[PDB]
Amino acid sequence: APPSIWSRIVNFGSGWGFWVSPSLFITSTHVIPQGAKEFFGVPIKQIQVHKSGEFCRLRFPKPIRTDVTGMILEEGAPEGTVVTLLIKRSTGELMPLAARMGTHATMKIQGATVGGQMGMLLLGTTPGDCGCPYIYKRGNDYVVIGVHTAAARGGNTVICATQGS
Ligand SMILES: CCOC(=O)CC[C@H](C[C@@H]1CCNC1=O)NC(=O)[C@@H](CC(=O)[C@@H](NC(=O)c1cc(C)on1)C(C)C)Cc1ccc(F)cc1
């Protein structure tokens, strides 16, 4: 993926988050810090936080990342679409993993219900990777489809948290 997209991925709590636009920031519910009084200098009360299972969306009252453009955000990718899971590691190493996305579904993961899309990695995902984006290109427009939330032990299945309607 291009550098402009990688720069949108920043460390966030126990995982990562993705600047969809200067004002919109998506991450995993499992990683958002629950005791924080602010994110990126903005008092938490001024941030509009939305939550759809494991998809956590933060709308900021003013542009924060003015250097980025507004990307397309969609609920998953068409079934069979090969996407790239942009994993950043704590070291700073970039570890783009290719995945073929599959069934959209409401899934039960460890008792909890998760809205998202199953994928298959095509050297895998690890505990610190949640919140990293699933990205693919459609023509000339890059598209983010969700954020990493889970991966099935004993197989290549990974779970991409998506946002509902
Ligand atoms: C906040 C502290 O924990 C973390 O590090 C959070 C991020 C890690 C990243 C995983 C960590 C490893 N490889 C990865 O990519 N995620 C999880 O652990 C998730 C659970 C799994 O990955 C499990 N997968 C499934 O249950 C699962 C079921 C199906 C189907 O697919 N995966 C186990 C492999 C750990 C946490 C979770 C629990 C309930 C939910 F509603 C939704 C999510």
| Residue 98 belongs to domain with CATH number | 2.40.10.10
- What is the phi/psi pair of residue 149, to 5°? -130, -30
Clarify whether residues 38 and 95 are in a common domain.
no
Q: Is the separation of the CB atoms in 20 and 4 below 8 Å?
A: no
Residues 56 and 89: their CA atoms lie apart, in Å, by 20
Clarify whether residues 82 and 156 are in a common domain.
yes
Clarify whether residues 31 and 104 are in a common domain.
no
Residue span of the structural domain in which 51 resides: 3-59
How many structural domains compose the chain?
2
Clarify whether residues 110 and 29 are in a common domain.
no
Q: Which tokens belong to 106?
A: 């409401």
Residues 133 and 131: their CA atoms lie apart, in Å, by 6
Facing residues of 134 across strands? 85, 146
29, 24, 66, 50: which is closest to 147 by C-alpha?
Answer: 29
Residues 20 and 15: their CA atoms lie apart, in Å, by 16
Task: Give start and end residues of each alpha helix (H) in the chain.
Answer: 3-6
Three-state DSSP state, 1: coil
Query: From the CB of residue 148, how many other CB atoms can be counted at a distance below 10 Å?
Result: 30
- Asked, for residue 67, whether it belongs to a domain, the answer is no
Which residue in 38, 75, 93, 130 is the catalytic one? 130
- Asked, for residue 66, whether it belongs to a domain, the answer is no
- Containing 38, the helix (H) or strand (E) segment is strand 38-39
Q: Which tokens belong to 85?
A: 């899971």
Pocket lined around ligand 1, Cβ cut-off 6 Å = 14, 30, 54, 109-110, 112, 114, 125-127, 129-130, 148-153, 157, 159
136, 133, 79, 74: which is closest to 103 by C-alpha?
Answer: 79
- Asked, for residue 65, whether it belongs to a domain, the answer is no
Amino acid at 54: E
Amino acid at 120: M
47: which residues sit within 8 A by CB, 6+ positions away? 39, 58, 59, 60, 61
Burial class of residue 71, CB neighbours in 10 A (0-12, 13-18, 19+): buried
Q: What's the Rg (C-alpha) of the chain?
A: 15
What determination technique applies here? X-ray
